[PDB]
Amino acid sequence: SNALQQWHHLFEAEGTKRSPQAQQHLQQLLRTGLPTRKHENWKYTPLEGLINSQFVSIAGEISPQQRDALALTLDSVRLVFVDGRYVPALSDATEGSGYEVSINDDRQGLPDAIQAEVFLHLTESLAQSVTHIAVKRGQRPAKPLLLMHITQGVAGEEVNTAHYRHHLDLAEGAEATVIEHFVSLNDARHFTGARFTINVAANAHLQHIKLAFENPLSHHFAHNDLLLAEDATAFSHSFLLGGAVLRHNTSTQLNGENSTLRINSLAMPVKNEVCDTRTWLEHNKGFCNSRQLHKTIVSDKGRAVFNGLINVAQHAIKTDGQMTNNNLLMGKLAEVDTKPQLEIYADDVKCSHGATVGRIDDEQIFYLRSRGINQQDAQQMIIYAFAAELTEALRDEGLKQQVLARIGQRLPGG
């Protein structure tokens, strides 16, 4: 493969002091190695492009003008990261924002991974620093925390790679909204990886939004963790639009009773792209309700891959959980591979999933065209309607509109 050794050399690279945690992760990364297409969980997601490449870690630098050119228009507390590196000059003062933020490589308090896989390990080892985010007890910050990631490629066939690591602690009774934004500086391809671990304490409310907006040629491999205590609420919305190959994991544990969890994602592969969206949920305590809505819209030889698993622990009674995956295939060469999965160790529970694969209604299209609306505009009205349930959960209208634009760029228009 050669890829593991390159990543290893990046690990041991010049003048970099690495935490014990990162080394521990590196070694299990090296122990399990890279998966093949005959692995249970790798059948539909191609590694061929990524594992034969020459990798470099090159931290470049950018101007404020470039940043704001790529930035969301939002009123927020915005931390800016470039090529795996925190950039104070481009960031906002966090004091008095409600967010206690510290960027450094001390990992001593970081929680263990819920489900361990090769790329989680890679990101853990190659992450240059950790963002420690804490919201104190009972606090409900006025502005959302925005974490903007600007990653760039390098000239040549070299793939510049960057790995980001964040941890957010919502203290008991805290309520906060946090957004991940991922963009490319330019059209040069790059390899991104990201891990965001979030701890939600008793009576804490989390809203997490992930926007992976990077360029058509790059690789985005991410694994997020949500830990919920009792009486806790967590919502996570991921809109994965960008990258040549994107694989996102959200692993959640419900470790306390009477907690609410909702996890959504939107995938929209165009042009040879592969979009892999995966979830791992464990109900380890009873009386928790969970809901999942995962929608894919596949165009143009694109491949959407859905994987999700609800594990109901023994004795976790009065569990209520549901998973829905709706897939729309508009390309004749388009493909969707979906595997909703239940593992249920308790009898007194309600757990269900459903998954659909469907087409564009030709009759609707024709009806719209017959009144003068162009075929493409029509198809866009219908598609937008199909994703509307997901985009409508964004409460900020200004943000929602930008997301809808990003969606629009991948439609048969613009």
Binding site: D361, E363, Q364, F366, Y367, L368, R369, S370, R371, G372, I373, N374, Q375, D377, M381, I382, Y384, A385, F386, A388
Partner: protein, 235 residues
Amino acid sequence: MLSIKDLHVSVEDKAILRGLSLDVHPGEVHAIMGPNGSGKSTLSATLAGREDYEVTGGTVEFKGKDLLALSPEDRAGEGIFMAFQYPVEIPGVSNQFFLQTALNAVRSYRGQETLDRFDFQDLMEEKIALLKMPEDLLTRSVNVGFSGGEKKRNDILQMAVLEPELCILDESDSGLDIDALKVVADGVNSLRDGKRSFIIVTHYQRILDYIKPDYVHVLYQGRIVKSGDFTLVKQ
């Protein structure tokens, strides 16, 4: 404005239509009758631009342009409108968004422009009143939760808003009653400026009592075997 000549159309491999000719001039109301399987709904489908209908001969041209070479949205831009026999439900798309997008489209195609929201919904209010539509129509998904009657009247409302030159009712009177038919009649009739023309493809003929045809045509095995004025009777 419309001229259709020796139309041989076939779906299935059907023999649907073997040579039909009809010429329509501005300000005219034409009625089209016959038994089922005569191809009348195929006539409508061919005019509207349905894809699976093979034209094996003759031509249909509209104001001197070949219509058959135009896409549905283009035929609509040219001013052809069809009231569907079975209006489609489009969940997730409001009547407002739909009608406004379509209107902007045909205004653009006609080199005119464009409705201010303020005036657009005045037009809408007027037409809602005219066809006795639910006052919340704008914010409801198109035809969702509508009965047959409400869908028919809704499409006539669309006709009123988009201001087409040629209006075709394709078996659009089906499943309606005496006064839903008075209502659609009012909507259609309010559109006679002496410019517009109307082709009524009838499911049954009581519609013609409230929209009176200037001309009447009869289909058999696709072909027009009879013609006349408002007065034609059967058996």
